[PDB]
Amino acid sequence: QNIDQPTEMTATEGAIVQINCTYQTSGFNGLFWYQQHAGEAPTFLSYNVLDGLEEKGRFSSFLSRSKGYSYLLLKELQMKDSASYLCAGMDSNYQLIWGAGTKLIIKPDIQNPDPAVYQLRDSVCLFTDFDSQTNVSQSKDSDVYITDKCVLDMRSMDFKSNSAVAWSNFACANAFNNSIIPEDTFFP
Amino acid sequence: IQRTPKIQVYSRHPAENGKSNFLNCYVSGFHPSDIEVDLLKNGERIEKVEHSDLSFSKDWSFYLLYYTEFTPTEKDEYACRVNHVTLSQPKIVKWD
Amino acid sequence: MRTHSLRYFRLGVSDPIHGVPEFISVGYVDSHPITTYDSVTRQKEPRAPWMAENLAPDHWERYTQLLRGWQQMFKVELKRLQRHYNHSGSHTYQRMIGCELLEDGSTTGFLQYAYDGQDFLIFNKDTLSWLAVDNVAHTIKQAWEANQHELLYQKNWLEEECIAWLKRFLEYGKDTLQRTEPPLVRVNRKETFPGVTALFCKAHGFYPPEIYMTWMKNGEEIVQEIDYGDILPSGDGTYQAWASIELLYSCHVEHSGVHMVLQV
Amino acid sequence: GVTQTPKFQVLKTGQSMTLQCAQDMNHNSMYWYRQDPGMGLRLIYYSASEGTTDKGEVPNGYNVSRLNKREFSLRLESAAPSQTSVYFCASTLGQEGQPQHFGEGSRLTVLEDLKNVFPPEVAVFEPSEAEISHTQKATLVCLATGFYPDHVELSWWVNGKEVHSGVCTDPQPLKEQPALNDSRYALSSRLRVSATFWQNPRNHFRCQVQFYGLSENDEWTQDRAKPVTQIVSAE
Ligand SMILES: *[C@@H](C)/C=N/c1c(NC[C@H](O)[C@H](O)[C@H](O)CO)[nH]c(=O)[nH]c1=O
């Protein structure tokens, strides 16, 4: 009948996150957890049918049959753990009841924030090096486009950063006026 | 290991000549499942015979119940003819 | 309530004769067939009116699909056992799964398999193990025990699901299963072979089938041999049985919480 | 594992469509799902074993074939815009809760007409001299604009080889005309390299966008170039 899990969850890289799932099924033949990376196929993570906690590396899954709930625990969070986590429960008729999923967002740990907006030529404005706390707001004007923050990892230099891009057919000084931008932001 | 069927022929109620009843043939303990059961009136096969579907025992053997509405008499001889792989020829078990 | 049980059987026959299906699966609540499926009908059907009246088409539609799948799996498992045993010709493969809800509220659960009608593998839900009767069963046990999730699933099925289904069907068939039909008990005395008197204690028209019958001399169980008759189905939904001795004798009958004495 | 074809497909309302699925794991059960935003996977049809199929939650407008033990096709009788979804084929060993194995997925877009199908316009934007001097880092921005439907795959190739480090593409494209129902999309990505890496002449940077549009079999009467599956790039 019903499988419930949060729509989305946000946690910090290096920390622990517990994704809950509550089931209200007519009978019970086990609870599954699947991982689905953006634009990819879901892959099996864990299965629980009896009460207890089952550990599979950094990931652990718990089941409480009396309480009618389960959780998927992710320890030592990595940016790679950003995916949708699908909860599925099996009926007394061996039917899968699929949860709507939980999008897990991992906030990177920004060691040296250096907020700054920049102009680029082939125009384009790039707001970059801001802490994971600041949020980028959507455009007002019709022919002005602003993308949400996206985390890049320069695996090489052990460096992660956030950025949002702005463009129109307009200046970089005014580009992000609809967003609460750091006071110490660098404008060339 | 094959097991021959146990055949038990008996009425539903204490029998009494001239008073309507039901004759039962309970065939059990056999293995494997292929069996042929017939109820007989003076060696002639009774046409109007009801039967249970093949039933299953915890000892892996099978059982069935075959019955017919009948009115017993002194002259009339009722029996249950059974054939199984364990049987060289069908076994005619007479009712008491 | 009394002790009640739910059990499902599967029968597989390789190279069957004409008529006889390759696969039959039948469910029971106590002595009552509740459901049926075979490889010919290819449909799960009710075997009781109270099953037909209480379970929606979707139950039968879904379970028919599962049985079509289970049928296929049985055909393959029997081909592998025959390969293992180096057996040709027609052979049988059987399964019995089930559970009991005892009077006291406690439960029992079981899952067993047979080959040629002899025990093959017996599941131990308490140790999450399979008891192998021979070397072929041992090869299967090793394969089966490798999936710990399947073993855990089975322990949950036997303990939780099975009991819930039994309780559900017990309510549907309340008027049949939970009824009591007391027995009609008589004693028959006869001088058989000269000097040999046989006393028969005959009981009939009773439901449930479990009855206890015994003979007593002066108020202590007859240390002489008692010949016990089987509990037979009368064909009207009731059962019959007897108990005999050879010679102050009394027949003792106990059925559904009522004790009855027939003095001679 | 599970192999499903095609990864992308554009269809005109009323067109027939077959999605193929094959598993070589000796699995018995096979499933066809549709993944829509805000909801759990909805089963269309399933096949419990070779020789049997049955309807799921959402079977209307679809039909299936369990060709053999290996294959499970899904047919769209007359394509409707409601059938615009992502389709997943899955397979299970048994029926008693053995884990499901999923196909790569198939994104289907059903349109009244193909007249608004456009491939992307790809442009690369060189890093800011102010960023180069402030951070000793160089951010290359790539833009794929005016594409429709949203059937794109953006990739970065440094000196002929694909790169993933210092790369980040938007997870969802932007509607360029949010008020319109047939709005075209825009999608950005960034590649961040070290200042000295960008300053080296002979270091080559290419943004690649694979578009999945029309096929040779699709009819095209329009004055403009037929918006076929193609790779559009910027360097
Ligand atoms: C209708 C409910 C018929 N069921 C049925 C079953 N059901 C019991 C159980 O779910 C099954 O045995 C699983 O394999 C346990 O793991 N079993 C059966 O053998 N025959 C049936 O008709």
Side-chain angles (χ1 to χ4, degrees), chain A residues 1-55 57-75 77-79 81-106 108-110 113-118 123-132 134-139 142 144-145 147-156 159-169 171-173 175-176 179-182 185-188, chain B residues 1-35 37-43 45-46 49 51-57 59-73 76-96, chain C residues 1-16 18-52 54-102 104-190 192-216 218-219 222-223 226-247 249-264, chain D residues 1-6 8-11 13-54 56-74 76 78-111 113-125 127-128 130-160 162-171 173-199 201 204-205 207-215 218 220-222 224-234:
Chain A
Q1 180 88 60
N2 194 35
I3 300 275
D4 300 286
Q5 39 171 151
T7 310
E8 196 191 86
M9 289 184 88
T10 309
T12 314
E13 170 180 64
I16 300 156
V17 69
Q18 192 187 295
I19 310 167
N20 300 316
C21 176
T22 74
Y23 62 96
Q24 279 126 315
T25 64
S26 150
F28 179 79
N29 281 305
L31 202 131
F32 292 88
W33 278 103
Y34 286 82
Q35 179 194 62
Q36 196 184 355
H37 276 95
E40 294 219 290
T43 61
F44 174 77
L45 269 193
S46 72
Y47 173 85
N48 292 71
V49 69
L50 300 191
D51 301 343
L53 175 79
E54 198 183 70
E55 213 144 62
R58 289 198 290 107
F59 290 31
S60 311
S61 49
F62 163 93
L63 177 73
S64 181
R65 266 176 313 172
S66 56
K67 288 168 137 68
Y69 92 100
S70 175
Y71 68 70
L72 179 72
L73 193 79
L74 315 191
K75 289 154 147 173
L77 290 162
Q78 278 156 59
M79 295 302 307
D81 307 320
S82 299
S84 238
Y85 293 87
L86 317 175
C87 184
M90 203 177 263
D91 215 283
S92 61
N93 281 6
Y94 305 87
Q95 294 168 309
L96 278 184
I97 323 297
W98 287 97
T102 297
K103 182 163 145 236
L104 176 71
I105 306 153
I106 304 301
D109 179 73
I110 306 306
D114 204 344
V117 181
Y118 298 118
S123 94
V124 158
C125 302
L126 177 94
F127 175 31
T128 195
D129 314 330
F130 53 92
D131 205 73
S132 304
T134 58
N135 306 286
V136 172
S137 276
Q138 294 188 70
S139 188
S142 25
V144 172
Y145 317 95
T147 61
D148 184 57
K149 60 171 166 185
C150 172
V151 195
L152 60 83
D153 176 43
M154 297 175 72
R155 305 233 313 169
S156 11
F159 170 92
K160 282 162 205 87
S161 61
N162 294 308
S163 49
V165 189
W167 75 97
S168 188
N169 305 260
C172 294
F176 299 87
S179 307
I180 16 111
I181 189 142
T185 308
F186 177 80
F187 281 92
Chain B
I1 301 161
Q2 301 184 324
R3 307 169 235 166
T4 220
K6 181 173 193 174
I7 308 141
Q8 291 170 110
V9 182
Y10 57 102
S11 51
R12 174 181 294 186
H13 310 278
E16 188 174 53
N17 288 331
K19 301 273 195 263
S20 181
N21 214 328
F22 282 84
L23 183 59
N24 293 309
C25 185
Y26 182 75
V27 181
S28 64
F30 63 97
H31 193 93
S33 54
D34 196 20
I35 197 139
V37 188
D38 273 316
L39 289 174
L40 316 182
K41 185 179 171 206
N42 302 302
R45 191 210 126 223
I46 298 151
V49 171
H51 67 100
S52 71
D53 275 9
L54 186 70
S55 306
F56 297 92
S57 291
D59 70 344
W60 311 110
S61 68
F62 320 95
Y63 66 100
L64 290 156
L65 177 72
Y66 274 73
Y67 64 92
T68 196
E69 177 110 65
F70 90 126
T71 302
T73 67
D76 300 327
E77 211 218 72
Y78 293 91
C80 184
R81 186 178 61 202
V82 176
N83 201 339
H84 197 250
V85 60
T86 54
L87 302 169
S88 276
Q89 54 158 257
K91 179 128 97 191
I92 299 164
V93 177
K94 295 202 201 95
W95 176 54
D96 54 4
Chain C
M1 198 35 225
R2 302 182 288 245
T3 287
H4 293 290
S5 67
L6 178 67
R7 68 212 215 270
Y8 290 101
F9 289 87
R10 296 183 199 166
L11 172 63
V13 178
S14 68
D15 195 69
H18 190 86
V20 164
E22 205 169 14
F23 182 83
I24 306 154
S25 181
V26 176
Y28 299 91
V29 168
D30 303 325
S31 53
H32 296 265
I34 55 149
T35 68
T36 194
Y37 177 92
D38 60 77
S39 59
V40 170
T41 64
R42 283 186 57 76
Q43 294 297 338
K44 194 205 177 165
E45 291 167 319
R47 265 303 161 267
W50 45 267
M51 284 294 286
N54 281 295
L55 290 160
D58 75 64
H59 170 83
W60 312 97
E61 284 170 3
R62 173 63 179 130
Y63 272 94
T64 288
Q65 300 297 324
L66 289 168
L67 281 127
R68 282 180 185 179
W70 292 331
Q71 179 181 318
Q72 194 55 53
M73 285 161 207
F74 233 62
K75 197 200 186 204
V76 174
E77 289 160 36
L78 181 45
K79 293 172 132 51
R80 295 174 202 293
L81 300 192
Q82 291 196 209
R83 225 218 307 229
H84 276 157
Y85 282 119
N86 196 55
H87 286 167
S88 53
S90 188
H91 292 263
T92 72
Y93 185 45
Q94 290 148 278
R95 185 210 214 232
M96 181 200 62
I97 195 162
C99 60
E100 303 186 304
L101 210 209
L102 282 62
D104 41 281
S106 76
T107 71
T108 73
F110 45 89
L111 168 62
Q112 297 170 10
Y113 280 88
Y115 180 84
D116 289 339
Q118 299 289 305
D119 286 340
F120 183 74
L121 289 160
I122 315 306
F123 183 68
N124 192 342
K125 70 180 176 59
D126 302 314
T127 65
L128 296 182
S129 260
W130 285 101
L131 187 62
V133 300
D134 65 29
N135 199 275
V136 167
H138 187 78
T139 295
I140 306 304
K141 160 196 174 80
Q142 282 190 325
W144 289 9
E145 296 183 349
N147 201 342
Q148 202 79 5
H149 288 168
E150 288 180 339
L151 303 173
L152 290 167
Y153 151 77
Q154 213 94 64
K155 196 221 214 311
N156 178 70
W157 198 83
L158 287 163
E159 299 182 354
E160 310 299 329
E161 288 295 288
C162 190
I163 299 299
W165 284 114
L166 168 58
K167 288 184 183 157
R168 192 172 162 175
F169 302 159
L170 265 199
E171 191 54 32
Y172 299 167
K174 199 172 190 169
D175 304 341
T176 300
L177 309 164
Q178 288 167 73
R179 92 196 191 264
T180 150
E181 288 207 65
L184 298 233
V185 184
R186 74 204 151 276
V187 184
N188 311 305
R189 195 216 229 100
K190 195 179 279 174
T192 58
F193 183 103
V196 179
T197 302
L199 289 167
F200 274 84
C201 193
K202 306 199 159 74
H204 84 284
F206 56 89
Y207 189 85
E210 305 71 38
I211 195 162
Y212 167 94
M213 300 168 78
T214 193
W215 281 101
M216 300 259 155
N218 298 254
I222 186 65
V223 185
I226 314 171
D227 181 18
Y228 291 95
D230 298 337
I231 299 168
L232 298 176
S234 291
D236 53 3
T238 76
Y239 295 77
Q240 54 173 81
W242 61 269
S244 65
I245 60 157
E246 279 158 282
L247 296 97
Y249 291 99
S250 73
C251 181
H252 279 236
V253 180
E254 171 82 46
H255 178 265
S256 204
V258 185
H259 181 74
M260 176 168 159
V261 184
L262 293 87
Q263 201 86 254
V264 178
Chain D
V2 178
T3 298
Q4 60 175 113
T5 65
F8 296 89
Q9 190 80 48
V10 181
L11 290 170
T13 288
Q15 268 191 247
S16 279
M17 168 58 180
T18 298
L19 292 83
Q20 312 255 270
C21 182
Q23 56 80 28
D24 282 291
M25 308 160 103
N26 200 53
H27 276 193
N28 288 288
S29 298
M30 288 184 81
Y31 310 85
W32 272 109
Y33 292 109
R34 61 175 289 172
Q35 200 178 37
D36 301 300
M39 60 210 326
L41 291 170
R42 290 187 279 165
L43 187 68
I44 301 163
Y45 278 92
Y46 73 105
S47 171
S49 175
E50 193 190 5
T52 197
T53 66
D54 200 28
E57 314 183 28
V58 290
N60 307 331
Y62 304 110
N63 39 95
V64 289
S65 273
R66 184 63 186 266
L67 307 162
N68 51 38
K69 199 186 209 250
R70 276 182 13 89
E71 304 152 65
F72 195 41
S73 305
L74 174 70
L76 269 75
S78 164
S82 47
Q83 301 174 321
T84 297
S85 192
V86 180
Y87 301 84
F88 284 99
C89 181
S91 78
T92 27
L93 194 47
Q95 303 176 97
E96 296 166 21
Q98 279 77 11
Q100 284 198 2
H101 293 247
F102 287 85
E104 45 274 66
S106 297
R107 169 99 213 277
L108 252 76
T109 291
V110 190
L111 310 165
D113 55 66
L114 308 175
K115 292 174 198 62
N116 193 47
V117 173
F118 287 87
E121 233 188 305
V122 182
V124 121
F125 294 83
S128 174
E131 188 220 352
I132 276 293
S133 195
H134 189 90
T135 61
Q136 310 319 129
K137 268 147 194 71
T139 304
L140 285 93
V141 176
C142 176
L143 250 43
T145 62
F147 58 93
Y148 190 90
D150 166 40
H151 283 196
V152 292
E153 284 172 339
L154 195 148
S155 49
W156 281 102
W157 304 69
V158 150
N159 297 309
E162 197 179 351
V163 290
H164 288 94
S165 186
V167 169
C168 115
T169 310
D170 306 340
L174 202 59
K175 268 163 161 267
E176 301 191 313
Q177 309 96 31
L180 312 174
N181 116 104
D182 60 344
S183 179
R184 289 194 216 145
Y185 308 86
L187 169 78
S188 64
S189 187
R190 315 106 180 107
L191 167 83
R192 206 176 197 187
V193 302
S194 59
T196 55
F197 191 96
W198 163 254
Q199 28 212 35
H204 159 88
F205 307 90
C207 186
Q208 216 198 244
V209 180
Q210 165 80 74
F211 178 69
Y212 295 90
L214 306 198
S215 85
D218 290 293
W220 196 255
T221 70
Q222 283 54 58
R224 65 180 170 101
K226 179 175 179 175
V228 297
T229 300
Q230 69 189 274
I231 288 156
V232 184
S233 310

